């Protein structure tokens, strides 16, 4: 049909000739010329060649692929044949049928907005006023504030002081869909309730942004508004954030407090041996909270607090056992958030990151779901609050260097020097010499790492009512690490301690390692080798993204049929599941 190959115009009369019309013109021209030749006595070889040419043109029209090409004038590129309008990433299938553009949506850049509840999500006034426009017209027609639709359009155009109240009304429960650009798995699209905000950013809860695999490096997110009643209720019942709290892959919880709260809680649950307020008795958690806010007791000092941890002896009951436990002020303050369930032992510990995941898991296990989401939101709030109140801050003098690193490195240097001399003295083959060198270098690296760790994690040697006591460090770094807040000890030792060995482009390992570290300087060669490694990693990522995309696309198109229909097939054949044993441990 003509309309499906439209001759699209330009500002004047420069109509952009869609290549389909070009191919059709070529073919019909061959046909007309060939008929005229057939009428004029048909010189045999001439008509022969002409039928050949017409066959060629028709073949090109059905598919420009085979038989050479049919290039347009002066534009060295093949023409979109009919098949070219069906196959490929631009063919109708992968371009318009399977995934079609939506007219009823929008996108923006996402900020944090760490105040909203777990199901809420920020939304700019501009975006909501543009999206929900038909709902606004409907509401205005209801209240009669604009009898005609064009009057309502004018009113929205002017944004009268009533349209904002109307909009706030029309979305009071109306859900909305938020989506990330690469939607790798099911959680890439979730349902929230919007809350009107200013600016143009799209706030979203930090937990779900850890679920979206969404940083705040400027990553954009798309919005969508389910308009039919079925879709609204469907988003509310299925894809609302308070429903997706476990990955469909693993039965692990996807809502994991990632950082900046694990730091907060971890700081709130520690113990300085001699901190202001140590040695008191508290009539309850609220008492400790008041004692702290008034600036009389440290946020973490050992005290004796009375606590009423509830329990479920029989299925349904909630007994109370008012105990007097030795704890710290911080843990007691945090206890004001556990919802009448979990015993005190879930908090009394140092409460790192894995401990937080464990606490959330056991809360979802005991209490159900709703108190668990409220509890997770309260955790997030208090974590940010006391993190800010802590003022955790990394300075240059925070990362320390062990006073043996210089000595250890000089000793390993003497070792490698005498080994190399031995080689040039003809006492060891070059290959085994390389091996010995890399071995002593790795040994010295482990030595430096262990020394740095043992000097950093316990440098805090304080005294109480007397001489001296050791304790786990209070250094900002390694507080961002022991708590699992951000970065592992492997990265710490790569920062303060020796950077260790590095890898050649091929995969081999350079003899001389990066004896230096990030706090100290790095010579040009050391930086060059580190660059080798880093560019290897980046190229690997830049290729693996596309490769994994193609892989998952192939996957989803071989299992897209499976739907669980039968309730019990009634068979007896399964597999013999047994714990895997690679030869070593299970």
């Amino acid at each position: 049909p003509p309309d499906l190959r439209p001759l699209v115009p330009l500002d004047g009369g420069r109509f952009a000739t869609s290549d389909l019309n070009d191919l059709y013109r070529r073919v019909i021209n061959r046909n007309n010329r060939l008929k005229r030749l057939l009428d004029l006595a048909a010189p045999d070889i001439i008509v022969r060649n002409e039928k050949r040419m017409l066959q060629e043109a028709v073949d090109a029209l059905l598919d420009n692929g085979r038989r050479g090409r049919a290039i347009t004038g002066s534009n060295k590129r093949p023409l979109k044949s009919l098949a070219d309008m069906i196959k490929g990433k631009q063919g109708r299938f992968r371009q318009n049928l399977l995934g079609k553009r939506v007219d009823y949506s929008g996108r923006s850049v996402i900020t944090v907005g760490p105040y909203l509840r777990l199901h809420q999500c920020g939304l700019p006034k501009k975006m909501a006023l543009e999206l929900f426009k038909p709902f606004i017209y409907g509401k205005l027609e209801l209240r009669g504030l604009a009898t005609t639709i064009k009057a309502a359009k004018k009113m929205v155009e002017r944004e009268e002081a009533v349209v904002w109240d109307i909009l706030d009304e029309v979305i009071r429960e109306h859900p909305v869909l938020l989506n990330r650009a690469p939607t790798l798995h099911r959680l890439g699209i979730q349902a929230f309730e919007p809350v009107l905000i200013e600016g143009k950013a799209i706030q979203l809860h930090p937990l779900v942004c850890a679920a979206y695999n969404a940083d705040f490096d400027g990553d954009q997110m798309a919005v969508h508004v389910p308009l039919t009643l079925e879709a609204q209720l469907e988003a509310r019942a299925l894809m609302m954030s308070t429903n997706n709290i476990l990955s469909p892959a693993n039965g692990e919880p996807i809502i994991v407090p990632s950082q900046d709260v694990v730091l907060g809680l971890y700081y709130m649950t520690r113990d300085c041996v001699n901190a202001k307020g140590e040695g008191m008795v508290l009539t309850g958690p609220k008492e400790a909270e008041r004692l702290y806010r008034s600036g009389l007791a440290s946020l973490h000092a050992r005290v004796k607090v009375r606590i009423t941890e509830y329990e479920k002896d029989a299925n349904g009951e909630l007994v109370a056992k008012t105990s007097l436990k030795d704890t710290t002020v911080g843990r007691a303050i945090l206890w004001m958030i556990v919802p009448k369930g979990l015993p005190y032992s879930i908090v009394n510990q140092a409460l790192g990151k894995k401990a937080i995941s464990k606490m959330l898991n056991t809360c979802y296990r005991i209490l159900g779901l709703k108190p668990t989401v409220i509890f997770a939101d309260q955790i997030m709030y208090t974590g940010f609050a006391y993190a800010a109140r802590s003022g955790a801050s990394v300075g240059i003098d925070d990362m320390v260097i062990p006073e043996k690193k210089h000595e250890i490195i000089s000793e390993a240097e003497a070792e490698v020097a005498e080994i190399q001399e031995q080689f040039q003295s003809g006492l060891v083959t070059a290959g085994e010499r390389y091996n010995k060198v890399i071995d002593i270098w790795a040994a010295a690296n482990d030595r430096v790492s262990k020394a740095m760790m043992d000097n950093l994690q316990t440098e805090t040697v304080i005294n109480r009512d007397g001489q001296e006591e050791k304790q786990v460090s209070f250094n900002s770094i390694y507080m961002m690490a022991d708590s699992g807040a951000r970065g592992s000890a492997a990265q710490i030792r790569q920062l303060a301690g020796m950077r260790g060995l590095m890898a050649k482009p091929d995969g081999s390992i350079i003899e001389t390692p990066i004896t230096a570290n990030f706090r100290e300087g790095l010579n040009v060669l050391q930086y060059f080798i580190s660059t080798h490694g880093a560019r290897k990693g980046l190229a690997d990522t830049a290729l693996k993204t596309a490769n994994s995309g193609y892989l998952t696309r192939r996957l989803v198109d071989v299992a897209q049929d499976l739907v669980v229909t039968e309730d019990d097939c009634g068979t007896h054949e399964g597999i013999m599941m047994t714990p895997v044993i690679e030869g070593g441990d299970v």
Binding site: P1, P2, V27, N32, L54, Q55, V58, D59, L62
Partner: protein
């Protein structure tokens, strides 16, 4: 957007899909090697019937 047209071709012509889509439909339908079929389609051979 809907109505289609037709072109009364002045002479029959092959359909490039069923000729060059391995395995070629015409080839298997005729027990003839594809090379000869291509050489006779494009007018550079003959075929006795």
């Amino acid at each position: 957007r809907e109505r289609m047209g037709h072109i009364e071709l002045a002479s029959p012509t092959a359909h490039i899909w069923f000729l060059k889509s391995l395995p070629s439909r015409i080839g298997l339908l005729l027990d003839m090697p594809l090379r000869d079929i291509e050489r006779v389609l494009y007018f550079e051979s003959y075929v006795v019937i």
